Paper text:
The 8-carbon sugar 3-deoxy-d-manno-oct-2-ulosonic acid (Kdo) is a conserved structural element of the lipopolysaccharide (LPS) of Gram-negative bacteria. Prior to its linkage to the lipid A moiety by the Kdo transferase (WaaA), CMP-Kdo synthetase (CKS, EC 2.7.7.38) activates Kdo using CTP in a Mg2+-dependent reaction that results in the formation of CMP-Kdo and pyrophosphate. Crystal structures of LCKS and KCKS from E. coli as well as of LCKS from Haemophilus influenze (HI-LCKS) have been reported, displaying either no or one magnesium ion in the active site. These structures show that CTP binds to a nucleotide-binding fold located in the N-terminal domain of the enzyme, whereas parts of the C-terminal domain are involved in Kdo binding and the formation of the homodimer interface. In the present study, we describe the enzymatic properties, the crystallization, and the X-ray crystal structure of LCKS from the hyperthermophilic organism Aquifex aeolicus (AA-LCKS) in complex with CTP at 2.10 Å resolution and show for the first time that two Mg2+ ions are present in the active site of the enzyme.
The asymmetric unit (AU) of the AA-LCKS-CTP crystal structure contains three molecules arranged into one-and-a-half homodimers. Each polypeptide chain folds into a U-shaped molecule with a central, predominantly parallel, β-sheet surrounded by α-helices. The two arms of the U-shaped molecule are formed by the N- (residues 2–91 and 220–234) and C-terminal (residues 100–210) domain, respectively, the latter being responsible for homodimer formation and Kdo binding. Compared to the previously determined ternary EC-LCKS-CTP-2β-deoxy-Kdo crystal structure, AA-LCKS adopts a more open conformation with a larger groove between the two domains. R10, T14, R15, and K19 of the CTP loop bind to the nucleotide's triphosphate group, which adopts a staggered conformation and harbors a Mg2+ ion (Mg-B) with octahedral coordination geometry. In the AA-LCKS-CTP crystal structure, an additional Mg2+ ion (Mg-A) is present between the strictly conserved side chains of D219 and D95. The octahedral coordination geometry in this case is completed by interactions with the CTP α-phosphate group and surrounding water molecules. Furthermore, only Mg-A is connected to the protein via D95 and D219, while Mg-B interacts exclusively with the triphosphate moiety of the CTP and additional water molecules. The crystal structure of AA-LCKS provides the first direct structural evidence that two Mg2+ ions are recruited to the active site, strongly supporting the two-metal-ion scenario. Moreover, the structure demonstrates clearly that Mg-A binding does not depend on the presence of the regular Kdo substrate, as was suggested for EC-LCKS.
Author numbering:
A (entry chain A): 2 to 232
B (entry chain B): 2 to 234
Write the structure that this text describes.
Amino acid sequence: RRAVIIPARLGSTRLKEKPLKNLLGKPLIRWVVEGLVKTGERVILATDSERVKEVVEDLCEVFLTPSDLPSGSDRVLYVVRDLDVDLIINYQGDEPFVYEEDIKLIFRELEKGERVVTLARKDKEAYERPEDVKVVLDREGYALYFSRSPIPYFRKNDTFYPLKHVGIYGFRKETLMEFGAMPPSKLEQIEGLEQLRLLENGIKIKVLITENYYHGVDTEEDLKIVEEKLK
Amino acid sequence: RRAVIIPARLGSTRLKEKPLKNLLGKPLIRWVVEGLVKTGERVILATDSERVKEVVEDLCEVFLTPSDLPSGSDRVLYVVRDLDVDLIINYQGDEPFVYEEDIKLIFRELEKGERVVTLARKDKEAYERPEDVKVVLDREGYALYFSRSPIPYFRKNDTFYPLKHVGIYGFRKETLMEFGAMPPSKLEQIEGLEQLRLLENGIKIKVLITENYYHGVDTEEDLKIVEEKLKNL
Ligand SMILES: Nc1ccn([C@@H]2O[C@H](COP(=O)(O)OP(=O)(O)OP(=O)(O)O)[C@@H](O)[C@H]2O)c(=O)n1
Ligand SMILES: Nc1ccn([C@@H]2O[C@H](COP(=O)(O)OP(=O)(O)OP(=O)(O)O)[C@@H](O)[C@H]2O)c(=O)n1
Ligand SMILES: [Mg+2]
Ligand SMILES: [Mg+2]
Ligand SMILES: [Mg+2]
Ligand SMILES: [Mg+2]
């Protein structure tokens, strides 16, 4: 009763036609799908192009969805409504690194009784970059807050923080539908961070610390960088 | 019953002997005490200093405390721990502004069943100053996080944020005791923010938004700021 859903639209703006961009001779979306199928889970691509569907068709289910859906999570919400499932992972279509254990860790955490779980890695590079999301945690590993600002403020030094949030999320289905029904919240819209809707509405997010390398492909520089890593 | 407890040790470092520092002809601590006494509440000064005691002894109770207590909240706990009260307000000794209705709002909030209550005000100037504490709230007004960093990040601007935290706290006695028994936590020590111990240990902090002006006196600059405000009411 599990699925990994991947939203991957064709109309990326910072890189032309992202899902189809070749990484070491293989389209980005195929890297993501290959890695996710190897985990043995049910994998569902949500896309708005048959050209993208045709690249991974052989490996997983694809569902076409309106191009004009305004976010990755709206695209996932749009396929999840019609899917009879209990536990969902939402995976970024531009994240070619996939680790079976993290997928497993996420699903186990949900089976323990968590409604929302996500990932974070120790990373100093992200600290002062507004495009990277930082996260701070309570003693049991629940997120206190996520921000584009450099959090925490280092009045004293530390080797654990700062953390970079990795935008992969596990949900219980009903919590994900609940999220879809809540109006956008105040800090969510200020920061441009959908995950704040959960926090602002008192939904706990379990954050798991991973050492595995993640790094999305948004720009031509990311593609060059992530190309080198995949060796 | 309830009490308001004011920790004021003599040994400030960023400004010398600050409770005794002259503020428009009155020592700083005397402003705080005079303000609090007109609330009608029981007001207690917690201090390590005979000179500090002498300046307010005519107005309120003074309790002696060890000079080596490591923070104001710890000085408050030192007297609270064998005081027969249910609810307390920890009011900073270097906060010369007092608003009776704010004191009442805090106590009412504790009477609803809150364990920890504090205040924040809209303040654009505090945003980029590390010495000032920003706070972000959930939809019910509970603190999500406090930080010296500029939070929230303004991908878009806002009418409400940013907020400056005003370091006045209401506690149920038992909650103040638990806090004192918790070891300093990780983000607390990174940020230099004791209140984070509460969040990291999963104790909810209710934050009420006040429109009243507050400003702590930590440096000579703060003292001038405060003097200018007080000459312009
Ligand atoms: N309207 C949107 C926007 C994003 N996504 C998906 O959400 C993920 C994260 O978004 P992002 O990395 O920003 O990709 P793009 O929006 O496509 O790229 P860009 O921001 O450069 O335009 C991507 O896999 C993307 O395909 C989507 O399905 N629908
Ligand atoms: N060990 C401490 C530290 C602080 N306080 C009290 O807590 C309040 C807030 O502390 P702060 O503004 O930092 O004053 P000081 O620590 O005394 O001064 P400084 O930090 O400049 O050395 C003050 O009323 C102060 O007297 C206290 O009782 N004992
Ligand atoms: Mg985008
Ligand atoms: Mg991306
Ligand atoms: Mg101090
Ligand atoms: Mg102060």
